[PDB]
From a paper:
In mice, the [name]-P1 family consists of five members, which include three stimulatory ([name]-P1A, [name]-P1C, and [name]-P1F) and two inhibitory ([name]-[name] and [name]-P1G) members. Of these, [name]-[name], [name]-P1F, and [name]-P1G recognize host-encoded Clr molecules, which like their receptor counterparts are C-type lectin-related type II transmembrane proteins that form disulfide-linked dimers via cysteine residues within their membrane-proximal stalks. While the expression of most Clr molecules is tissue-specific, [name] transcripts have been identified in most tissues except brain, suggesting this molecule may represent a broad marker of healthy-self. Indeed, downregulation of [name] has been implicated in missing-self recognition of virally infected, cancerous, and allogeneic cells.
To understand the molecular basis underpinning recognition of [name] by [name]-[name], we expressed their corresponding CTLDs and determined the structure of the co-complex to 2.9 Å resolution. The crystallographic asymmetric unit comprised eight protomers of [name]-[name] and sixteen protomers of [name], which together formed eight highly similar [name]-[name]:[name] complexes (root mean square deviation (r.m.s.d) ~ 0.5 Å overall Cα atoms). [name]-[name] engaged [name] via a head-to-head docking mode such that the N-terminus of each molecule protruded from opposite ends of the complex. Surprisingly, a single [name]-[name] protomer engaged one half of the [name] homodimer, making contacts exclusively with only one [name] monomer. This unusual trimeric 1 [name]-[name]: 2 [name] stoichiometry was conserved in all eight of the complexes present within the crystallographic asymmetric unit, and differs from the 2:2 stoichiometry observed for the related human NKp65:KACL complex, despite similarities in overall docking mode. Unlike [name], [name]-[name] was not observed to form a classic homodimer, most likely due to the orientation of the α2-helix, which protruded in a fashion that would sterically clash with a neighboring [name]-[name] protomer. Instead, two symmetry-related [name]-[name] molecules packed together to form a distinct non-classic homodimer. Within the crystal, two trimeric [name]-[name]:[name] complexes were bridged via an [name]-[name] dimer to produce a hexameric arrangement Here, each of the [name] N-termini lay planar to each other, indicating that these molecules could potentially be arranged in cis within a single target cell membrane. [name]-[name] and [name] interacted via an imperfect interface that was modest in size, burying a total solvent accessible surface area of 1450 Å2, and characterized by poor shape complementarity ((Sc) = 0.55, where 1 indicates a geometrically perfect fit).
Author numbering:
A (entry chain X): 91 to 175, 181 to 214
B (entry chain U): 94 to 176, 180 to 212
C (entry chain S): 91 to 176, 180 to 215
D (entry chain Q): 91 to 159, 164 to 176, 180 to 214
E (entry chain O): 79 to 196
F (entry chain I): 77 to 195
G (entry chain J), I (entry chain F), J (entry chain E), K (entry chain P): 73 to 194
H (entry chain D), L (entry chain A): 76 to 196
The structure:
Amino acid sequence: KLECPQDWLSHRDKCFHVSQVSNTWKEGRIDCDKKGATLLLIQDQEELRFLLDSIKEKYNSFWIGLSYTLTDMNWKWINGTAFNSTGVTENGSCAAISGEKVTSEGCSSDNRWICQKEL
Amino acid sequence: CPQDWLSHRDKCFHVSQVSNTWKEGRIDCDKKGATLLLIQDQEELRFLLDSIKEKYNSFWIGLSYTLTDMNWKWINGTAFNSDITGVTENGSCAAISGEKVTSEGCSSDNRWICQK
Amino acid sequence: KLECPQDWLSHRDKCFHVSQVSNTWKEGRIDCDKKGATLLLIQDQEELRFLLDSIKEKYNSFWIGLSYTLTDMNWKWINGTAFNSDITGVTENGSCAAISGEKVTSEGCSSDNRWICQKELN
Amino acid sequence: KLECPQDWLSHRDKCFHVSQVSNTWKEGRIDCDKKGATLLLIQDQEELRFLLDSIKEKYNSFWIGLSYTNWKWINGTAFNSDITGVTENGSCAAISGEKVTSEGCSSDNRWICQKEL
Amino acid sequence: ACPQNWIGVENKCFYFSEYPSNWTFAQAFCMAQEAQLARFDNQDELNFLMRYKANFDSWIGLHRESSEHPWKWTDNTEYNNTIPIRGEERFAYLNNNGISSTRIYSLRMWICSKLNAS
Amino acid sequence: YAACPQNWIGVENKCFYFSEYPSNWTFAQAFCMAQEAQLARFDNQDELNFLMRYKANFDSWIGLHRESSEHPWKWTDNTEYNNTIPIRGEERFAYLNNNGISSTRIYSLRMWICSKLNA
Amino acid sequence: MNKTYAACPQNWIGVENKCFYFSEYPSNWTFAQAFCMAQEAQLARFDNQDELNFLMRYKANFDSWIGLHRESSEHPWKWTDNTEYNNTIPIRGEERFAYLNNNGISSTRIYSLRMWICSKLN
Amino acid sequence: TYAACPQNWIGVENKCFYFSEYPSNWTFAQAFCMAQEAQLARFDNQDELNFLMRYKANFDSWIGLHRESSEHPWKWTDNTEYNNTIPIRGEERFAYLNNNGISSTRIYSLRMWICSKLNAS
Amino acid sequence: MNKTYAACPQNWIGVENKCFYFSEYPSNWTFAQAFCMAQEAQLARFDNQDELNFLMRYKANFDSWIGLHRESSEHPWKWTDNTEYNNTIPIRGEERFAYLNNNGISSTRIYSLRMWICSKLN
Amino acid sequence: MNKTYAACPQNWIGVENKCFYFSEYPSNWTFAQAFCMAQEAQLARFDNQDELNFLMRYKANFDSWIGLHRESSEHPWKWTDNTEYNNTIPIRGEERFAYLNNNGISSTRIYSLRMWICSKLN
Amino acid sequence: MNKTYAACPQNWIGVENKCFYFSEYPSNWTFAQAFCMAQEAQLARFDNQDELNFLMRYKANFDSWIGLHRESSEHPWKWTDNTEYNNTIPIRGEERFAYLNNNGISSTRIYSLRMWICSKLN
Amino acid sequence: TYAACPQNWIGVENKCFYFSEYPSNWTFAQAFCMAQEAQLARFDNQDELNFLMRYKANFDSWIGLHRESSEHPWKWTDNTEYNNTIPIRGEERFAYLNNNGISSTRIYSLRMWICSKLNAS
Ligand SMILES: *[C@@H]1O[C@H](CO)[C@@H](O)[C@H](O)[C@H]1NC(C)=O
Ligand SMILES: *[C@@H]1O[C@H](CO)[C@@H](O)[C@H](O)[C@H]1NC(C)=O
Ligand SMILES: *[C@@H]1O[C@H](CO)[C@@H](O)[C@H](O)[C@H]1NC(C)=O
Ligand SMILES: *[C@@H]1O[C@H](CO)[C@@H](O)[C@H](O)[C@H]1NC(C)=O
């Protein structure tokens, strides 16, 4: 079984890349696809706690693979299943790790992102 | 009374547009063959105030406080009697500031009222 | 016979006013009419010599009642007989005459210049 | 026989380095010593003709191992005209154009280091 | 001489935060230091802000009533729109792409600006 | 450009207020503070010329004060006055008159001028 | 505070939404009006008592040109807009061009010299 | 630091102006200024124009304006076109300052003149 | 060229090695003198005919304060240096403070309002 | 000499009829383009060899943004006008945004940080 | 507010009691040091962690000259005062002249090109 | 309004600069600049000097600074003394720019040059 790319974070059977570059959520998805990855899908609280403790630049928000659409009236992951118990407000919003919590923000806002690769 | 002076009872008044120290005010009245204002009664004061127009300025009068006498004296030169100088006493000179007689520093620049 | 106005120059049976104010020749004519006068008509060299010696501000040009029009192709006074060489030293087009120095000069009628008004006594 | 360094010029049994950096003749000597080299000693007219044709930036002057301390090489035998075209005072020599010129040793100039094989 | 933690650029005194907050708190923080959320009046001021803000998305003094309303400074003077703001949100911040926008509650670093005066 | 408030006059980068009635130094200083201003300060010849010209014939308080006759003249900033135009009289509070600048008591009545930067 | 403003260009004075300009030397009506026009202004216009009070106060003791003119003594006073004057402050004299003096407003000929005042909206 | 204008010249900011003692035609006036390493006066700001109008007194004075004809634009001696801030009166080719502002006349007309040059090194 | 220089500070006029300032409004002798002193200058001093001609020409029609004063009518005219005036241009009137008028030099009391010229060496 | 000029605004460099602005710090293409547009300019356009020589020289050894972009590797190079590039100096790399380097012109990502050049007509 | 002040001269940045100059282009150590001395400054000196953090932050991604030099690889690092370095942040490389990089402080020969930072007390 | 600088010249604020493509001695260089109504480069501020140092690239270039001898002061082409902000290197009579700042060489030495003049008309 193959190992994580040269300068990516390794946890369980997942590879993470934290961008230094910021853009819209749509443009974030495009950068992960160009990298042969997907936006971050948080499997558990352990994975979240790891990422936060390995970020260092905790003072910036990061897009994740979670968005709210009017068509479904629900929060859906990009994999693409509905979210189960995001501290904020729901309209035409996308999720992002802002501080030590998952926050709902406008999808047009410029934010960095976390790409993930599955092993 | 002279051509452009105010007339009341048996007195002539001149209100200056020019300002200086109390000492320099006295000098201007002497050059004019006059003296600084000596208010005889409340009627004379009420007249002057109603004939000034530029009520928003202060005017020197012939009243000063000297340490030698420890009293307020007119320049004629009778000690002052309350028949009221509202301010503080040091090495001061009196002036009509508003509708009241006020004690001010003699070095301050103020207009004046001469009388004949 | 009545006398010249309070602060006008007197010579023979004529009154002169030298302006300190400048404008076009057209506007110069208008100022003389408002004054009940006309622009200067030089009768002889004696009248000219008098005016020059009574000007003082010799460093300025003064409009006179003489203009050149294409309709006549001649220099005409405003009175309005044709001019005779008894001399306008300059160029002729759509010009007006003015005393510039000790000579009558042809200038553009749009130029700003002072003027000399005259009143006849007779 | 050993070969010239990676980015030096090779001719006969000599290695040349032409600097892009300029300083006094004294500071030029110091740079050659740090490089384990010496300032340029022209052996013949063939060596000179080669260097000139391999310079490219012919519009700059280059210090050589010749100085008026009369005129002596840094090896250190006295100079023979068989010619430094300029003026002599407390001068150092430099290749200015297609001729050896005498200049002030305090002037900022580039230099040519040489390594013998 | 600007107060401690503040940087002096020409006649202005700037404060670059160390910890992030929302647009309401950020505005309140600046006001307490007799300042306001950063305003740039020329190219030089904008260049300084962009350069020194480093990799910190930082709030500036630009707000909107809605997406269909014009951008106004904290003075309530309208923005000259020289550098158009990205996003369809009501509160602007500086990023590496220029100026972007988010909701009132999002956390970002801030920039306070005041005149060096007395 | 940005017009000065109502009743104020704009001169370059400053906004000036000339009172409509006289009052003591303390109320005048308090009045200027209420308008986010201070008793009038002149920084150049132009500012002083304006004040002297528009002051008209009204003796008017300005931001200069002194602790005592033996103390230096200071602005409301507490910055000492360059004494370009020396103040006449031996009192603690300065005002503009036709002769230049004079001094009187805190309790005397004068017209006043405020000053603030257009900001 | 975090920004500085001006209200008026250099040498102008701001009174509410207007910018007045007070000359440093006198000239005639023609040059004065031309000077204001070059600064995208007009000879001074007062619309209220406050504007007129400022003009009268800051003009000091200088007889200064304003923006009122009339075709003749029998014609009404008009602004430079050609809008008629409300005659609130009656103009003294029987001449065609207005100016401010210590008594209020007086009149003279185009050619007389006076200080001037320009006004334009901020 | 401050550098004084030559004798008979007046210094206004960074410029040196010269006011003639006698009148002449535009051609001699332009030639006179050139001899002093100057040109027939040019005003670049309201302050420079105010100075000229004030000090020219009651003397109609030549300035550095010319135009090829009535239908041609006004140009400076640089051959740079005039900003037309103060429009020139008259239908003639050479400009001079008067009490009404700026008017125009013919090349052979006698006017007083003004030069101007920068107080440059 | 290379660089440009100024003969005098802003709002001052340069005449040879001297700088002169002309006021924009009138004031008494005391303020006028105080103003000049604050700019490291004095109320104008003319040392030659050229300096006096400039002052008379540029002062326009404004009666202006110059730096001549006398102790009384029977005392000599002195400059602010306390050097006596050469009396080339006699001063009119029987007062203590000199000013320039359209006729030449006249005198008035300290308190009268006039314009004012400052002077200083460049 | 009697007038001074500047050719370009402050912080800009003039080469004939064009004005150039060289950044002080690096940025990505988006901010750089936004900066130039705000100054009524565009990312640097070299018309001729002289303009290109200057850019290459004055930029020192800083990889600097120029106004050449392409939609994709298979699309033609266009200026910010959307006018196609004459391909005189072919651009190295297979990326969408051009930039000057020591070798000539190369290609990178919208997000790469580079010093920039703004250009506009004088 | 009634008066405004500046922390430092134009093109300099103020951080408490110090002023700093960040170059717009690279140069060698000799020119850099000469440039700072001309502005009554020295190549940047940091006295605390806050000063060093400012320098590292504002220097962007430019390898930039500071005021640290050593006689040889076997000699101690000294400031331009000739006061010895406290060696809090050890310097990478075996050369005589110090510059700031993204990793901290590194070293090179006198003749290499880099941006520079000047420093002087306010 | 502005005024573009001439062909082969770079414009920087109120000045205009010419950088040579060929070398010469100081005498020819000075003569060349004078013919273009200019002088060998003069820098009056740090901004002007930064320009010259940045744009001169790797071309050691003549600037308008000379000395009578090693014991004499440095003078501009105006003959105004040098403010000595950037002390010139070497003990020679004719200055030029290099990567170290300003150095000096003999009359006869060949170098490229910089002309400088005010953008004026
Ligand atoms: C989508 O991802 C979430 C974790 O982010 C996970 O719980 C869920 O099972 C995933 N869905 C599928 C179809 O694997
Ligand atoms: C002095 O004047 C006051 C009024 O001002 C008067 O009461 C008093 O009698 C006067 N004294 C003399 C001697 O007349
Ligand atoms: C017109 O005036 C001229 C003198 O200017 C004179 O010679 C001529 O006779 C006049 N004409 C008439 C009709 O009087
Ligand atoms: C010194 O070098 C020169 C050539 O540069 C040569 O002619 C001479 O022989 C050398 N001297 C010695 C001792 O080798």
